[PDB]
Structure formats: structure tokens, C-alpha cells
Design a protein around this nucleic acid. Sequence first.
RNA 1: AAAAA
Length: 519
Amino acid sequence: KVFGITGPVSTVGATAAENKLNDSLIQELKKEGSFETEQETANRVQVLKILQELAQRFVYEVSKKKNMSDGMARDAGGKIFTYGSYRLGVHGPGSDIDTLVVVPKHVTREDFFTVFDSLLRERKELDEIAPVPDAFVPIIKIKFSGISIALICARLDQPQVPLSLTLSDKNLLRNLDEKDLRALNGTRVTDEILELVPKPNVFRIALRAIKLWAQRRAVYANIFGFPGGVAWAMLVARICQLYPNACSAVILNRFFIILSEWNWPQPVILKPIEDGPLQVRVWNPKIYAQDRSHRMPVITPAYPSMCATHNITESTKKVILQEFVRGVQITNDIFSNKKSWANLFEKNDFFFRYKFYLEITAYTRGSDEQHLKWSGLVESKVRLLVMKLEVLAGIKIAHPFTKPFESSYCCPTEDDYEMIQDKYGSHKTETALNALKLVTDENEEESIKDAPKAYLSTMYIGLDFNIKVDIHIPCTEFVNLCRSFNEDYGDHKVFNLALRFVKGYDLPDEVFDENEKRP
RNA sequence: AAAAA
Ligand SMILES: Nc1ncnc2c1ncn2[C@@H]1O[C@H](COP(=O)(O)OP(=O)(O)OP(=O)(O)O)[C@@H](O)[C@H]1O
Ligand SMILES: [Mg+2]
């Protein structure tokens, strides 16, 4: 049993004391809501039934539009595969379902963003929709029967996709567009990770703990330059390979030690990187300057191997490492009977730890869908601002928080919209925004539900200075950069973007939870 | 072609 590219660090098995801490770890995971209910799971499976119905109808309808016979259009098939954390079996109650739609050659992504998009919109169950056709991997994001779904589409080079099709055959990848290869590899990567760990259930528990920890410590969000689900999965998988007989609790301790001691940017790799024909691009820092720039590379096992942490910046690297060091101290303390699992999973203090914050607000006076598009675009560029800021001589760190803050306002007139852009983002002025603000208290209320809305999504970057530092160049670049995608958001009567420098004590109330109090 | 699954 060779798992991975080296032998194990240790084949020593778990002691009674370690197994006791493993039992306690699992109980803390349960208490903290790591595992969804049976009903919640049933709800996911029901969505998957509908998505398959839609996928096949999608392929049939496209086929017919391309003048194929009734019988041939049916034979074209189409199917779905899960991928991501639900397929891996480490999802929680709040996790999305990642769904890959596999379609034959005559069905393209333009079809996906027109016909399949159309089919989703017919559904009474559709709560939200935000198509993102221009992304490294194009996606339709939806909320369906209250469940977040991520939908991507891979076009195979064959006339038919039978329901029985599997993705094991590497021949299926021949000559495929880069975007489709990435799509198919969502599913293939999950399956290979499970193949590459000595004890899948030890791996699953350890990963559930790392997902909870990373969420709590605010080091989980691919979009903002932190590792996402697959990067965290592969990191845990590597530790599992190195300690094949350890319990999950011990894997956590070793995870923090090994990854804090790791000689970054040496890559984390789960299996020898497969060579392909010269037509196919594989992660290789010797050939590609871009790959050489990856700060903490975590490489997917599925051919062709890619880096799952391209978005990591100098600042987010420093934060991840700080958190690993904390993990070492706390897990050691847990194993020496001084601390609890609860201590490890304690919430971050992002909004207490810096003197200064840069506040980024995307405004939309329009539909919820328009706001999802605009705010999604802006959110996707925040890491670019982080990178521009962190290279400025006077900046010690530019630390992005991992989730936007959403709010909406009743906004009957053009003048009201201009007022909202004035008063928001400062605790000094934020009380004046009410009572236009929508709350879970009065949202049911006919006047509130019926009113035109202005929507806000606000992101924060924590700032620490090497010292006033002039930050106008990165900020102005960012403002202008977002505007040009392309002319879709140039209308200032509907879309706006504002950046605000804010000191810690003037941070909005939204930022602090019930248990917490303003500095 | 500034890597939103
Ligand atoms: N940056 C990336 N590099 C490589 N593959 C990725 C990347 N981001 C997403 N994926 C693929 O898409 C899948 C789903 O992405 P998603 O962001 O939903 O993460 P996940 O693993 O499902 O975890 P969770 O949804 O619980 O946060 C991943 O598991 C992975 O296979
Ligand atoms: Mg997911």
C-alpha cells in the first residue's frame, strides 16, 4: 500500500488516549452542525432528480433545434454527475450541490446558457439565478428549493451521452476545450482523492474538522484568495497518506505541524503528475511563469493536473500560516489535556484585529438578479485589489474577509438611491439609512415586499501599515477595472461601486454578531 | 484574454 509520492512519516497506530480524543472530536463536529439532517439530505436528492430531468430535456431540445430527428434527439442522451463536497461525503447543511452536466458534441455552452438557463426559469422551485458565462469555469449559480446549486457543463466529443457513462476513460479528454476538461475533472478529482487516501473515513472526519476550522478562522473562500473545499481536501489527503494508521484527531495535529513547517512554494501533490501529449497543459513552474508564481501550490491528481490555489496572495499566505501555527499550539494543548476541540473551532476576530479597513460596496438599484451579477463580478475582483495593495511599500498586510455582507433598502426614487450611496458604510451615518432598511422583522410586510429595492454587497480588507500611506492607485485601478465588463454595468442609475477607508471603531453594526460588541 | 465551480 503506497499512497502518494513518498513513504509514510509514521505507520504508528492510534493509542487509547488518541482514540478517546477522536471520539470527542466527532461529537464536537455533530454539536457544531457538521452533519446535515436526513430530511436535508432527502431534499438534496430530490433536486438531483429534477436536475437530471432537465439535463436530458435540455439535450433533447437542443438536438431538435439542430434539425435532428425525434428518435436521434432522444438517443443524444445527456446526464449529470455530482462533484465537490457532496460527492466526497464531507458536505454540511449549508454546502452547495456541485452538479456537472455532461452533453454531446452538438450541445455547446451557448446552448447551456440559453436553453438550460430557460428550463431552470420555468421552475417554481427556482429562488435565485446568477449565470456566470465568463469565468475560468463558466457556471450557472442557482438557489433551488432553498438549496444552493452550482451548475457547470462539459461537452464531450461524441454524438451521444448515455445515462450509464462513466468518466474513468482518459480517452474522453482528447482534444477537449480547457473549460470542458476542468468541468469533467470536478467529478474525476473527487473520485481520485478517495482512491488516494489509506482510510477514507479517517480522511472524511479530518476534512470535516478542517472545513469547520477554516470557516471559523476565516481562511476558507477561493474567490477571496483562501483555499476552498478541494484545496483543503487535498491538503488533508496528503497528511492522511503520511500517517496511514493514525486517527483523525492525530491527523489534525500533524496537518498543522507539517503544513506550518512546509517549505512553500514546494507543491502538495497526491500522486505522480501524469504526462500527456504536447497539446495538453499540465502544472509546470519550469515552463510556465504563472505556475512559478503560485505561493502555496496544491495540485489536483486528475489528468491534466492543475493548481487549486492560484488565488493565494502574499497576504492570504501569511494569514493561512498564522492559523496553522495557532492550530499547532491548540492541538498540542488538546493532546496534553489543556484545551478542548471547541477552543480550536473558536470564531475569528477579523473585525477587532486591525485599526483600519477598506470597505468595498457594490450597489444595485434594480432586480435581485441584476445585483447578483454586478456584486458577483465585483466580488471576483477583490483579490486583484488585495494583490495591488500588498505590494505597496507602506502596506504590511491587506487581509480580505471571506464573506460579503448583504443588505437591501426600499428605494422608490432616483433621489433615494443617491441618498443610500451617501449614508452607507459608517456607524456614524448608518442610523440615517433606516427606516428604509429591510429586516427579517419587517421584510411579509406588503409595503416592504412591494417596494423597489436598492441592494448592497459589502466586502472588507483589513489593513496594517508599515509606518499616511497613499493607497489611491490600487483603489482607482480597482474602481475602473470593475466598470469595464463590459458596458453591461456602465449605467450609474442602476449600478454603483464605492470604496471607503474606515477605522475600526466606525465599522458598521452588521459586522458584529449578537455576542460581540464594537471596539 | 487579470483562474467567480
Ligand atoms: N480553484 C480550484 N481548482 C481546482 N478545482 C476546483 C477549484 N475550485 C473548485 N474546484 C472543483 O469544483 C468542486 C466544487 O467547488 P466548491 O467551491 O463547491 O468546493 P467543494 O469542494 O464542493 O466544497 P464546499 O462546497 O463544501 O465549500 C471542487 O471540489 C473541485 O473539484
Ligand atoms: Mg461545493
